[PDB]
Amino acid sequence: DPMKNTCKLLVVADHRFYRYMGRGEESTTTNYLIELIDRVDDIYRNTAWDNAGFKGYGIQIEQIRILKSPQEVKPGEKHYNMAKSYPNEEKDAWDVKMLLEQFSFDIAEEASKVCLAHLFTYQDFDMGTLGLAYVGSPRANSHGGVCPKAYYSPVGKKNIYLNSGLTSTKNYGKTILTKEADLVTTHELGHNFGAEHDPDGLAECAPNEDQGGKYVMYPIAVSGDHENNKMFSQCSKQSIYKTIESKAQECFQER
Numbered sequence: 338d339p340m341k342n343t344c345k346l347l348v349v350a351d352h353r354f355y356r357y358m359g360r361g362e363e364s365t366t367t368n369y370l371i372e373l374i375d376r377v378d379d380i381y382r383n384t385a386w387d388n389a390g391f392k393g394y395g396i397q398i399e400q401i402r403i404l405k406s407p408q409e410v411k412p413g414e415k416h417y418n419m420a421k422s423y424p425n426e427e428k429d430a431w432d433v434k435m436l437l438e439q440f441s442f443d444i445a446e447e448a449s450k451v452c453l454a455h456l457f458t459y460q461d462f463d464m465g466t467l468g469l470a471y472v473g474s475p476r477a478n479s480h481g482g483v484c485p486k487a488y489y490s491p492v493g494k495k496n497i498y499l500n501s502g503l504t505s506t507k508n509y510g511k512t513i514l515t516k517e518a519d520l521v522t523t524h525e526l527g528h529n530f531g532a533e534h535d536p537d538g539l540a541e542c543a544p545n546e547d548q549g550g551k552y553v554m555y556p557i558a559v560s561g562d563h564e565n566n567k568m569f570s571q572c573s574k575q576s577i578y579k580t581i582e583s584k585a586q587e588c589f590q591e592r
C-alpha cells in the first residue's frame with residue numbers, strides 16, 4: 338500500500354536522557370525527540386529505495402515514554418532504566434548489546450504494538466559506540482528489525498520482539514552535536530529497516546570526500562559535514578527496499 342508507508346514507533350527516553358538532554362523537563366525532552374524523529378523522517382521519506390517511485394516511506398512517533406526517574410531495582414534484578422550500569426557498575430554505561438537486549442525484554446509488551454521501539458539514552462558506551470540496532474530482513478521468519486516477530490522467552494514467560502534500537506547522545510564525555518544525533522538514529526533505524534554497513538570499494542557505497550563522502554550506513558560514524566553523509570548508499574537501498582516491500586503490508590501504517 339502506498340498508504341501503508343509509515344513505520345510507527347515507540348520512542349523511549351530513559352531517566353539519563355531526561356536528565357542530561359531534557360533538562361529534567363518533560364516538555365523539553367519530548368520536543369527534542371519529536372523534532373529529531375521528524376528530521377530523521379525527512380531523510381527516509383525523500384529516499385527513493387528503488388531509485389524510482391518507491392518513496393514516501395518513513396517513520397512516525399506512535400507513543401513516547403519519558404522515564405523521569407530510574408527504575409527501582411531489587412538486589413539481583415536489572416532493568417534498562419535502572420540507576421546503575423550493567424554488568425559493570427563502575428562504568429559510565431551498560432555493555433551496549435546487553436542494554437539493547439534488556440530494553441527489548443522490559444518493553445516487550447509495548448514493542449508488540451508498534452513497528453519499532455527505540456531507546457534514547459545518555460551514557461558513554463565504551464570504545465566510541467553511539468548506538469545499536471537489530472537488523473531487519475525481508476525473510477518471512479526474520480527475527481530482527483521492522484515488524485514485531487516474536488521470540489519466546491522462558492524467563493519472563495512471554496514473547497519478546499527484536500524490533501528495537503537505541504541511540505546515546507553522549508560520547509567521549511560530551512554531548513554529541515544535534516546533527517550527529519540525527520545521523521546515529523538514522524543509521525540505527527537503517528539497520529532495523531534491513532541495512533547492513535556500507536563496505537569500502539568498487540561498489541560505490543563509500544565514496545571519497547571529493548565525491549560527496551560516505552553514506553549514513555558507514556560503520557565509522559560520518560560527521561554529517563558531507564553531502565552523502567545523511568543519505569543512504571546503493572548497498573543500503575537494495576537491502577532496505579527488499580525489506581520494506583516484503584514487510585510494509587504486515588506492519589506499516591498510514592502516515
Ligand SMILES: CC(C)C[C@H](CC(=O)NO)C(=O)N[C@H](C(=O)N[C@@H](C)C(=O)NCCN)C(C)(C)C
Binds near residue numbers: 466467555556
Ligand atoms: C552511528 C554509528 C555509525 C554507529 C556505530 C555502531 C554501530 O555500528 N551500530 O549500529 C558506531 O558507534 N561507530 C563507532 C564510531 O564510529 N564512533 C566514532 C565517533 C569514532 O569513535 N571515531 C573515533 C576513533 N578515534 C565505532 C564502534 C566504529 C567506534
Ligand SMILES: [Zn+2]
Binds near residue numbers: 525556
Ligand atoms: Zn551500524
